[PDB]
JSON list of C-alpha atoms in Angstrom, two decimals:
[
{"chain": "A", "resi": 1, "resn": "UNK", "atom": "CA", "xyz": [272.15, -1.41, -37.88]},
{"chain": "A", "resi": 2, "resn": "UNK", "atom": "CA", "xyz": [270.45, 1.77, -40.05]},
{"chain": "A", "resi": 3, "resn": "UNK", "atom": "CA", "xyz": [272.81, 3.77, -37.23]},
{"chain": "A", "resi": 4, "resn": "UNK", "atom": "CA", "xyz": [276.02, 0.72, -37.83]},
{"chain": "A", "resi": 5, "resn": "UNK", "atom": "CA", "xyz": [275.38, 1.99, -41.38]},
{"chain": "A", "resi": 6, "resn": "UNK", "atom": "CA", "xyz": [275.39, 5.60, -41.04]},
{"chain": "A", "resi": 7, "resn": "UNK", "atom": "CA", "xyz": [278.12, 5.73, -38.73]},
{"chain": "A", "resi": 8, "resn": "UNK", "atom": "CA", "xyz": [280.49, 3.48, -41.47]},
{"chain": "A", "resi": 9, "resn": "UNK", "atom": "CA", "xyz": [279.24, 7.18, -44.03]},
{"chain": "A", "resi": 10, "resn": "UNK", "atom": "CA", "xyz": [279.90, 9.97, -41.27]},
{"chain": "A", "resi": 11, "resn": "UNK", "atom": "CA", "xyz": [283.46, 9.03, -40.57]},
{"chain": "A", "resi": 12, "resn": "UNK", "atom": "CA", "xyz": [283.34, 8.44, -44.53]},
{"chain": "A", "resi": 13, "resn": "UNK", "atom": "CA", "xyz": [282.91, 11.82, -44.60]},
{"chain": "A", "resi": 14, "resn": "UNK", "atom": "CA", "xyz": [284.96, 12.74, -42.29]},
{"chain": "A", "resi": 15, "resn": "UNK", "atom": "CA", "xyz": [287.80, 11.63, -44.87]},
{"chain": "A", "resi": 16, "resn": "UNK", "atom": "CA", "xyz": [286.57, 13.48, -47.56]},
{"chain": "A", "resi": 17, "resn": "UNK", "atom": "CA", "xyz": [286.66, 16.44, -45.39]},
{"chain": "A", "resi": 18, "resn": "UNK", "atom": "CA", "xyz": [290.06, 15.69, -44.12]},
{"chain": "A", "resi": 19, "resn": "UNK", "atom": "CA", "xyz": [291.78, 15.38, -47.59]},
{"chain": "A", "resi": 20, "resn": "UNK", "atom": "CA", "xyz": [289.57, 18.28, -48.46]},
{"chain": "A", "resi": 21, "resn": "UNK", "atom": "CA", "xyz": [291.47, 20.46, -46.20]},
{"chain": "A", "resi": 22, "resn": "UNK", "atom": "CA", "xyz": [294.34, 20.18, -48.33]},
{"chain": "A", "resi": 23, "resn": "UNK", "atom": "CA", "xyz": [292.07, 20.34, -51.84]},
{"chain": "A", "resi": 24, "resn": "UNK", "atom": "CA", "xyz": [289.58, 23.05, -50.52]},
{"chain": "A", "resi": 25, "resn": "UNK", "atom": "CA", "xyz": [287.27, 24.40, -52.56]},
{"chain": "A", "resi": 26, "resn": "UNK", "atom": "CA", "xyz": [284.00, 26.60, -51.77]},
{"chain": "A", "resi": 27, "resn": "UNK", "atom": "CA", "xyz": [281.63, 23.41, -53.81]},
{"chain": "A", "resi": 28, "resn": "UNK", "atom": "CA", "xyz": [283.74, 20.62, -52.64]},
{"chain": "A", "resi": 29, "resn": "UNK", "atom": "CA", "xyz": [282.88, 22.17, -49.66]},
{"chain": "A", "resi": 30, "resn": "UNK", "atom": "CA", "xyz": [279.72, 23.33, -49.31]},
{"chain": "A", "resi": 31, "resn": "UNK", "atom": "CA", "xyz": [279.76, 19.67, -51.47]},
{"chain": "A", "resi": 32, "resn": "UNK", "atom": "CA", "xyz": [280.70, 17.99, -48.20]},
{"chain": "A", "resi": 33, "resn": "UNK", "atom": "CA", "xyz": [277.86, 20.09, -46.24]},
{"chain": "A", "resi": 34, "resn": "UNK", "atom": "CA", "xyz": [274.62, 19.42, -48.02]},
{"chain": "A", "resi": 35, "resn": "UNK", "atom": "CA", "xyz": [275.89, 15.49, -47.76]},
{"chain": "A", "resi": 36, "resn": "UNK", "atom": "CA", "xyz": [276.43, 16.25, -43.09]},
{"chain": "A", "resi": 37, "resn": "UNK", "atom": "CA", "xyz": [272.84, 18.30, -43.58]},
{"chain": "A", "resi": 38, "resn": "UNK", "atom": "CA", "xyz": [271.82, 14.73, -45.32]},
{"chain": "A", "resi": 39, "resn": "UNK", "atom": "CA", "xyz": [272.06, 13.18, -42.92]},
{"chain": "A", "resi": 40, "resn": "UNK", "atom": "CA", "xyz": [271.56, 14.27, -39.68]},
{"chain": "A", "resi": 41, "resn": "UNK", "atom": "CA", "xyz": [267.06, 14.84, -41.09]},
{"chain": "A", "resi": 42, "resn": "UNK", "atom": "CA", "xyz": [268.53, 10.90, -40.97]},
{"chain": "A", "resi": 43, "resn": "UNK", "atom": "CA", "xyz": [269.68, 10.70, -37.41]},
{"chain": "A", "resi": 44, "resn": "UNK", "atom": "CA", "xyz": [266.43, 12.83, -36.61]},
{"chain": "A", "resi": 45, "resn": "UNK", "atom": "CA", "xyz": [264.13, 10.36, -38.40]},
{"chain": "A", "resi": 46, "resn": "UNK", "atom": "CA", "xyz": [265.08, 7.37, -36.31]},
{"chain": "A", "resi": 47, "resn": "UNK", "atom": "CA", "xyz": [265.15, 9.10, -33.18]},
{"chain": "A", "resi": 48, "resn": "UNK", "atom": "CA", "xyz": [261.42, 10.47, -34.47]},
{"chain": "A", "resi": 49, "resn": "UNK", "atom": "CA", "xyz": [261.05, 6.77, -35.35]},
{"chain": "B", "resi": 1, "resn": "UNK", "atom": "CA", "xyz": [293.47, 25.01, -39.93]},
{"chain": "B", "resi": 2, "resn": "UNK", "atom": "CA", "xyz": [290.30, 25.65, -39.52]},
{"chain": "B", "resi": 3, "resn": "UNK", "atom": "CA", "xyz": [289.31, 22.95, -41.45]},
{"chain": "B", "resi": 4, "resn": "UNK", "atom": "CA", "xyz": [291.94, 20.18, -39.72]},
{"chain": "B", "resi": 5, "resn": "UNK", "atom": "CA", "xyz": [289.54, 21.25, -36.99]},
{"chain": "B", "resi": 6, "resn": "UNK", "atom": "CA", "xyz": [286.66, 21.16, -38.43]},
{"chain": "B", "resi": 7, "resn": "UNK", "atom": "CA", "xyz": [287.64, 17.61, -40.02]},
{"chain": "B", "resi": 8, "resn": "UNK", "atom": "CA", "xyz": [288.75, 16.55, -36.29]},
{"chain": "B", "resi": 9, "resn": "UNK", "atom": "CA", "xyz": [285.02, 17.22, -34.46]},
{"chain": "B", "resi": 10, "resn": "UNK", "atom": "CA", "xyz": [284.01, 15.19, -38.01]},
{"chain": "B", "resi": 11, "resn": "UNK", "atom": "CA", "xyz": [286.00, 12.39, -36.73]},
{"chain": "B", "resi": 12, "resn": "UNK", "atom": "CA", "xyz": [284.03, 12.63, -33.54]},
{"chain": "B", "resi": 13, "resn": "UNK", "atom": "CA", "xyz": [281.34, 13.47, -33.91]},
{"chain": "B", "resi": 14, "resn": "UNK", "atom": "CA", "xyz": [281.83, 10.21, -35.97]},
{"chain": "B", "resi": 15, "resn": "UNK", "atom": "CA", "xyz": [283.59, 8.11, -32.90]},
{"chain": "B", "resi": 16, "resn": "UNK", "atom": "CA", "xyz": [280.14, 9.00, -31.71]},
{"chain": "B", "resi": 17, "resn": "UNK", "atom": "CA", "xyz": [277.98, 7.07, -33.60]},
{"chain": "B", "resi": 18, "resn": "UNK", "atom": "CA", "xyz": [279.77, 4.96, -33.69]},
{"chain": "B", "resi": 19, "resn": "UNK", "atom": "CA", "xyz": [278.93, 3.97, -29.40]},
{"chain": "B", "resi": 20, "resn": "UNK", "atom": "CA", "xyz": [275.24, 5.47, -30.42]},
{"chain": "B", "resi": 21, "resn": "UNK", "atom": "CA", "xyz": [275.13, 2.76, -32.19]},
{"chain": "B", "resi": 22, "resn": "UNK", "atom": "CA", "xyz": [275.22, 0.55, -29.64]},
{"chain": "B", "resi": 23, "resn": "UNK", "atom": "CA", "xyz": [273.65, 2.96, -26.59]},
{"chain": "B", "resi": 24, "resn": "UNK", "atom": "CA", "xyz": [270.56, 4.31, -28.22]},
{"chain": "B", "resi": 25, "resn": "UNK", "atom": "CA", "xyz": [267.98, 6.70, -27.70]},
{"chain": "B", "resi": 26, "resn": "UNK", "atom": "CA", "xyz": [266.19, 9.88, -28.87]},
{"chain": "B", "resi": 27, "resn": "UNK", "atom": "CA", "xyz": [267.69, 12.72, -27.24]},
{"chain": "B", "resi": 28, "resn": "UNK", "atom": "CA", "xyz": [270.82, 11.82, -27.56]},
{"chain": "B", "resi": 29, "resn": "UNK", "atom": "CA", "xyz": [270.15, 10.93, -31.22]},
{"chain": "B", "resi": 30, "resn": "UNK", "atom": "CA", "xyz": [268.96, 14.30, -32.18]},
{"chain": "B", "resi": 31, "resn": "UNK", "atom": "CA", "xyz": [271.38, 15.82, -29.98]},
{"chain": "B", "resi": 32, "resn": "UNK", "atom": "CA", "xyz": [274.43, 14.09, -32.58]},
{"chain": "B", "resi": 33, "resn": "UNK", "atom": "CA", "xyz": [271.83, 15.69, -35.15]},
{"chain": "B", "resi": 34, "resn": "UNK", "atom": "CA", "xyz": [272.52, 18.98, -34.61]},
{"chain": "B", "resi": 35, "resn": "UNK", "atom": "CA", "xyz": [276.39, 19.36, -33.74]},
{"chain": "B", "resi": 36, "resn": "UNK", "atom": "CA", "xyz": [275.90, 18.27, -37.50]},
{"chain": "B", "resi": 37, "resn": "UNK", "atom": "CA", "xyz": [274.01, 20.65, -38.48]},
{"chain": "B", "resi": 38, "resn": "UNK", "atom": "CA", "xyz": [275.92, 23.10, -36.71]},
{"chain": "B", "resi": 39, "resn": "UNK", "atom": "CA", "xyz": [279.53, 21.53, -38.30]},
{"chain": "B", "resi": 40, "resn": "UNK", "atom": "CA", "xyz": [277.59, 21.49, -41.79]},
{"chain": "B", "resi": 41, "resn": "UNK", "atom": "CA", "xyz": [276.78, 25.29, -41.26]},
{"chain": "B", "resi": 42, "resn": "UNK", "atom": "CA", "xyz": [280.41, 25.97, -40.46]},
{"chain": "B", "resi": 43, "resn": "UNK", "atom": "CA", "xyz": [281.62, 25.10, -42.99]},
{"chain": "B", "resi": 44, "resn": "UNK", "atom": "CA", "xyz": [279.16, 25.94, -45.48]},
{"chain": "B", "resi": 45, "resn": "UNK", "atom": "CA", "xyz": [280.36, 30.07, -44.41]},
{"chain": "B", "resi": 46, "resn": "UNK", "atom": "CA", "xyz": [284.00, 28.99, -45.05]},
{"chain": "B", "resi": 47, "resn": "UNK", "atom": "CA", "xyz": [282.71, 28.07, -48.41]},
{"chain": "B", "resi": 48, "resn": "UNK", "atom": "CA", "xyz": [281.15, 31.46, -48.93]},
{"chain": "B", "resi": 49, "resn": "UNK", "atom": "CA", "xyz": [283.99, 33.48, -47.05]}
]
């Protein structure tokens, strides 16, 4: 369900980070970092719900 | 480098979440949520560094 969709976004983000590791800079990294934090907040809400 | 190692942990976490979506419960989910937050904090530090 919604967790299946979130696992997809997390697999997409791991791929962003694999690419980022060959083309790094602060902006993109702190960008992906905040993407993970948003997904973690959604997961937390599903845990509470 | 260290970013290559982190991309590996993120691909591992996406796999945890894919499995979790068929066997969910609050503990494990809030567990994985805090795992993402720790990885995001490491990424942020690399961005700053």
